[PDB]
Amino acid sequence: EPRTPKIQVYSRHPAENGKPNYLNCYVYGFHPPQIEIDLLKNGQKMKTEQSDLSFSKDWSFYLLVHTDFTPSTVDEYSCRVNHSSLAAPHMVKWDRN
């Protein structure tokens, strides 16, 4: 029985347009552990770094994916997750608010 991932997309620091920042996607609570995660800019895959896969009795499996980014007034950023508990990949949009 799979357990569906939960997905948090956030910037390391409060967003200001045109200032460099870090974009993060934390996904957790899932089983089985095989999972695919990307960060997207306007629907296109960004180059990212991905933490070590880890397990906790309180969180099941969890992973953090992150990259540099510079928010603007028009550019959209999202996290895309594919996992066997899902019928198709899910995307969560970064919301600066």
Residue numbers in the entry: 1 to 97
Text of the article:
Major histocompatibility complex (MHC) class I molecules (MHC I) present antigen peptides to the surface of antigen presenting cells (APCs) to active T cells through interaction with T-cell receptors (TCRs), which play pivotal roles in antiviral defense. The overall structures of Ptal-N*01:01 display the common characteristics of classical MHC I molecules in other mammals, with the extracellular region of the heavy chain folding into three different domains. The α1 and α2 domains construct a typical PBG that contains two α1-helices and eight β-sheets, and the α3 domain and β2m display typical immunoglobulin (Ig) domains and underpin the peptide binding domain.
We also determined the structure of monomer bat β2m without MHC I. And the key residues binding to α1α2 domains and α3 domain of the Ptal-N*01:01 heavy chain are highly conserved in human and bat β2m.
